[PDB]
Every structure is written in C-alpha cells, then in structure tokens.
C-alpha cells in the first residue's frame, strides 16, 4: 500500500492528475494538489478537504525552477517528507514541421521534459534522506513517434531517457523511477467533441473501448506502492493494446 505516504502530483488540479490524486488520497496518502492554475488548485483542495482527505495546495509553474523549489518547500514544511512524485503536468503544441514556431517547441519541451527534470531534482534529495522514494513520470504513446507531434514526441521520449538514467542512478538510495505512457484516455476534451471525431479513434482501439482516468490512477498506485521497490526503469503503457500497433 501507500498508507501514510506523501504524494506530489504535478498538474493535478484537473484531468487524470486530479483523479490520480483522489485515488491516492483514498488509499491513505497525503496528496499535494499542484497546478499553474491557482483557482483550479483551490477548487480541488477545497473539494478534497471536504471529502476528508489530507491535502495541500501548491501553486507553481513546474517549468520554472524557482516556483518548483517553493512547491517542494511548501510540501516539506507541511508534511515533512515527499515519498512519491508523479510528474503528470504536461501540454502540447503540434503541427506540421514547417508550421511549428520556435515557441511551440520551447514550451512543450519546457513543461514536459524540463519540468519533469526540475521536479525530480528538487524532490529527490528528500527521498534520499528517507531512503525511500517513488518517482513516476507520465510520458505518452507518442514517444514512439507521432506525425505532426515533433515537440511532444521529442519531450516525452526525453522523459523516457530520464526515467532510465535516474532509475540507474537513484536506485541505490531506495528510489524507483518509472514511466507510464498513456494511450487514449476518456477526457473532457473527448466529451466536448463531435461524434465523427470520436468514432475514428475508437476504431483504432484493440479493446474497442476508451481507457478511463482510473486506469491511469490504478497503474500509478501499483508503481508507487511500498511493495513495488524492485520495479524501476520501466515504461508501462496504459493503452488497451494500441501501443502494440498504432498504424
């Protein structure tokens, strides 16, 4: 289990990150709700506290080192330790190679790849002190390559290399570093779409059904578990088989 562990989930004020935080809190963890959206932070913190959960809001642009350090300080002041870090905050600017602005590239790299580097760096020293840590990075099936997704594929593939490098380096300190690569997941974007969009993608799913945020939360609960200390350096797809062939 993860009873009495402290979990920092970046970008967890909405979407699957929030659902991962909820399920973590329900399984006995103190959760830090993070987002760059300070109002989404407060709303989720309020929601969780009402549900009886041990929760702290930590507003910070995880792409900014100073903001990241303040988040980690706020977490340590509050809970005294950081047992689990889920680098869930991410974003994408996509487009044909010729249409990608330098800014489309810089930001996708900054949030997904550097942000994951900044949070992992700022947190790991505390896990070293406690001789226990779980770092799980959220990548994507798109690290395998997606047309029109040069920045996203580059960034999330970089997250895969970081996962492998740090799994090797931090293992001796009792820290595991793993990566979850979600395929296609039922999201608010999805519910705000027109039918014809939906029916093409579903047709590309081996299960014929969409994955749900709980599928991600449940997979992350496994990797974060106290019992999963011998699992590290892994890239685990939550795709319903789509990652086996995405053509």
């Amino acid at each position: 289990g993860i009873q009495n562990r402290v979990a920092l989930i970046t970008g967890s004020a909405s979407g699957m990150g929030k659902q991962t935080a909820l399920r973590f809190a329900e399984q006995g963890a103190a959760v830090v709700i993070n987002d760059i959206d300070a109002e989404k932070v407060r709303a989720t913190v309020d929601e969780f506290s009402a549900r009886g959960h041990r929760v702290l809001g930590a507003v910070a642009d995880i792409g900014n080192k100073a903001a990241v350090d303040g988040m980690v300080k706020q977490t340590i002041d509050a809970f005294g330790r950081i047992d689990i870090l889920v680098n869930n905050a991410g974003m994408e600017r996509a487009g044909a190679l010729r249409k990608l602005s330098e800014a489309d590239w810089d930001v996708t790299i900054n949030v997904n790849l550097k942000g994951t580097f900044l949070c992992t760096q700022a947190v790991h020293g505390h896990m070293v002190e406690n001789k226990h840590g779980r770092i799980v990075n959220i990548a994507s099936r798109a690290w395998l390559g997606g047309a029109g997704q040069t920045p996203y594929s580059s960034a999330k593939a970089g997250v895969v290399g970081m996962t492998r490098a740090l799994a090797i380096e931090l293992g001796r300190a009792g820290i595991t570093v793993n990566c979850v690569a979600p395929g296609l997941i039922h999201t608010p974007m999805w519910d705000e779409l027109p039918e014809k969009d939906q029916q093409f993608l579903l047709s590309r799913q081996p299960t014929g059904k969409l994955g749900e945020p709980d599928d991600i939360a449940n997979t992350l609960l496994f990797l974060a578990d106290d019992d999963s200390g011998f699992v590290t350096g892994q890239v685990l797809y939550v795709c319903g088989g789509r990652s086996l062939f995405a053509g």
Binding site: G171, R172, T207, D215, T219, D227, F230, V231, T232, G241
Partner: protein
C-alpha cells in the same frame, strides 16, 4: 476474476504467486511436475484458508496440457487468470548445445506456454474476461551462453503481444512479467554479493517482488493494460537495448 491457474507452481515464485492471489480471495489451481512439492504447497494454502486444487503434470505435449486445463475447468467452471511460471532451462555455450537441447528448450520454454494459451484464451474470450500473465526472465533478450534459453524465451515476446491484440476486444489481457535476478536461499552468498552489486537498487529480487507484479496485471482493474513486457529487475533491464 475469481479463478486462477498457476502453471509450474512448484517453485518459490509459484508459491509466492499463489500466496498473493489467494490473499486477494482468488480460487487457485496449481499445476506442476513435482506432486510432492505441489501437494505440500496446496496443503499449506488450504491450511491458511485458501481454495486450492493441485494437478501433477510434467507435460509439454499439447493434448496433455489441454487435459490439465479441463481438470481445472471441471472443478471451478472457468479460468479467469492464467499465470505461466517458466520451467528451468539449461543455459550453455553454443558448442555444448546438442540437437535435443534445442528441441527441449523450445518444447518446455515456448511450445508448452503456447499450448496453455491456446487451451485457455478461447474460454476467456467467450466468458468476456481473462488475465494472462507470462513469467519470463532476462535471458529472452539474449546473453552469451544462453542461446537455447534465449531462443525459447524470446518467442514469448511476439506470442504474448500477438494474442493480446487478437483477444483484446473480448475483455482479455495478455502481459509478461520478466524476472531479473531472484534470491533463492540455495544461491551462494558470494554469488548474491556479486549479483547485487550489478543491480541499481543493490539488492536481489525476491519471489514476492515477482508475485506483486503478477498480481497487478491479474487484477480486475488492469483491464486497459495489455501486451506489456514488465521487468521486475531492480533496474538491471535499463542496461539492455530494446527492453523499452
């Protein structure tokens, strides 16, 4: 997700898998070659309160395997979970590899698990629920003086993923747990100290480590995870190309 068959349950990993699954209320069927060891295991598990049956069988021929499966289905009426623990294989340099060493490795290492999957997957797709977990090890990636083991284990990679895709629509998942180095209490302390140094987490794996990953893949809620090659290795798999 109430009934599970553990093939080659008569070793320390099979025991640990049985304990984890029984711990979650799963009814168990334990297949293996060593009836003595199998019965002692069933006795212990029943003694703790688990529903369990044993089936002695050292078979690799398809017909005998289908029979074993039928026994289980006779008792429980369904197989929700298939865990194929690997059988021991002799790793040897190429010159020491004989014509029969090749055939045996393929039969016990690859053909046998295939036959189990053929006997169980149709049932699972028909019932609309299935969790298949193949237990392999790092030799499938290929190391010096393991060619006959590597050829057999390596076949499970494409096999599991092929059937994962073939069965996906019917609520079945097929995944692989790849064991790294597991402590055994018959390994010399000197080969433990040497092996642990080469593992990033600086410890050997335990059978419980393996069962924990098997239990995750077999859970009712792991319905969107299929075709996966999950290493339980302490990080040693990060040293291999093509493990991701």
């Amino acid at each position: 997700g109430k009934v599970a068959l553990i093939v080659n349950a008569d070793d320390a990993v099979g025991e640990a898998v049985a304990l984890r699954l029984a711990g979650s209320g799963v009814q168990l069927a334990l297949a293996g070659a060593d009836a003595g060891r199998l019965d002692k295991l069933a006795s212990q598990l029943a003694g703790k309160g688990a529903t369990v049956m044993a089936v002695a069988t050292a078979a690799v021929e398809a017909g005998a395997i289908r029979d074993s499966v039928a026994q289980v289905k006779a008792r429980y009426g369904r197989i929700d979970v298939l865990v194929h623990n690997e059988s021991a294989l002799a790793a040897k340099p190429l010159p020491e590899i004989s014509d029969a060493d090749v055939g045996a490795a393929l039969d016990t290492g690859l053909a046998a698990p295939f036959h189990y999957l053929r006997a169980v997957v149709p049932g699972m797709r028909e019932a609309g629920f299935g969790r298949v977990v193949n237990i392999s090890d790092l030799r499938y990636l290929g190391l010096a003086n393991t060619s006959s083991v590597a050829a057999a284990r390596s076949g499970l990679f494409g096999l599991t993923r092929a059937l994962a895709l073939e069965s996906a629509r019917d609520g079945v998942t097929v995944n692989t747990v790849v064991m790294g180095d597991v402590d055994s209490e018959t390994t010399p302390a000197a080969e433990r100290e040497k092996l642990a140094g080469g593992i990033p987490v600086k410890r050997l794996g335990t059978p419980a480590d393996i069962a924990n990953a098997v239990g995750f893949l077999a859970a009712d809620s792991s319905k969107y995870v299929t075709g996966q090659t999950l290493f339980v290795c302490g990080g040693k798999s990060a040293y291999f190309s093509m493990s991701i």
